[PDB]
């Protein structure tokens, strides 16, 4: 069993020449150490979802695509507490008629909680939490409310290990 809810924060700054290049990528990793992990445990990476981000009263819309660096489960031997996980994010211009998942309001930076999540939770818990998360987003609830319910469900009897991402863009003018 594992019991920690751990998170890490990474700051992505979209560079000015994104106007020309229309692409940017970053691969973030983090060493999680859950000192509460006892016995043997399996940490499973949860399937991510693309995120449409809106900046400057939603006049700039960015597509964020996430991918696990390694899609395999992490097997923690007896009382092994430490593991390293990571993901890649690719930023590109959104399809214009895309619906914004997260908005900076009138500014150019947003916090995006839980862009990528691992959990020690059971197959049954993971399956239902992942379905309810997908249905949460389709129903029109806010990204944060959906992520919060997803974390709460995974963490019931397990550990949750989450990546948060701040995205900032100050285009050249």
Swiss-Prot record:
Q: Which residues of the full protein are shown?
A: 21 to 193 of 344
Protein name (record): Uncharacterized fimbrial-like protein YehA
Q: What else is known?
A: The operon is cryptic under classical laboratory conditions, but is functional when constitutively expressed.
Q: Please provide the Gene Ontology terms (biological process) for this protein.
A: cell adhesion involved in single-species biofilm formation
Query: Which keywords are on file for this protein?
Result: Signal
Q: Which residues cross the membrane?
A: none
Identify the species of origin: Escherichia coli (strain K12)
Expression induction or repression: Expression is negatively regulated by H-NS and subjected to cAMP receptor protein (CRP)-mediated catabolite repression.
Gene Ontology cellular-component terms for this entry are:
pilus
